């Protein structure tokens, strides 16, 4: 069962948000943000999958959700470049993390829910 | 399949806000307000079968949830009274509601996504 | 200085909401709402000048934002009829309220701010 | 007047978040972040005077909240590192814009005002 979830929704139309490109990084020793797992979102708004209980250590990871081409995509011609939300990842036993997003196209939520 | 579902977050936790009341109110042609339905939030904070595809007709329905009880059960006494969304049911086939809720012991917001 | 302020914005738009409909009610001792004031807010988003110190005691408010007819005369029919605002007001001194809304189509959310 | 400012409410505490750091950045040509402005929010949670009409030009800004120090001193160990906005400033004629941001230890929200 994956340890990091991200489920995205749609304030102006009131649904899933459908096809949003994800990018998740994880910052190194050098202190530069790495490419660590990515993907799209489904029909019911959620991005499953993005990795492992192995893969998936302590650290500082950031969630970049690309909303302002799923803006484009709909019809909408946004102002936010992107909704981005940095976490650190602590070990206790095991912890499972999602990361929950509403957008519009001025604003946007993001929410770290954690569940065993 | 329910036709309607609640889930409410914690973000203060940061966690499904667990065992929270939830009461669903439907507007009589005598406009006041009727119990419907209600429940409490699983430790998924999610409440399913509050109602069915036959009792669940186009109207107006306002859907309380009791936060001040819940955030007095965590050790927290807030501010606000409850949680409260006010909507339109409307019939286009079928159509599933959730209302999605974000506690704070100050602020809420809700969402009402519109599924298929 | 009005202790009760309330200001709306527009997550659609990325503005204030101007000329949104304002309705505070107030719980009597026979457990009904009666109206308390109402404004509209202005360019800002703002609506000052609801109460006065003298009239604004301890009690249970309701604060009921038109958010229906603000979107139609934008062009948008939403889905939510009316966000509104349950909380109580306490004595300790002298504390001023403000409520500040952000709304959606298809979301909300609100805050209670208290500055003194 | 300054064409950007920058405020952050408290959704625990349901106040203004006073002295909260904030640090302006801007894309250059070369595609790195450089420092553009910072400050700290005022007793109304408002950063104001961050830079000049002459100085805000077109461009990709972030608006970075350091959300897990504010937190600290008040005595919440958070999990969010930072609340963060990434907008793109155009030209029209003039545009202000005010970055409003509600703040949870789990949670953030964000919105771009546009004023004139």
Redesign the interface.
Known sequence: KCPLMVKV????????AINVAVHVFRKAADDTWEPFASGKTSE?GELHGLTTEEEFVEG?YKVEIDTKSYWKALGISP????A?????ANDSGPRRYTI?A?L????????????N
């Open positions: 929704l749609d304030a102006v139309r009131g649904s899933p019911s500082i102002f936010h470049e992107h981005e939300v940095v976490f650190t929950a509403l519009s196209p001025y604003s946007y939520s993001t929410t770290l829910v954690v569940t």
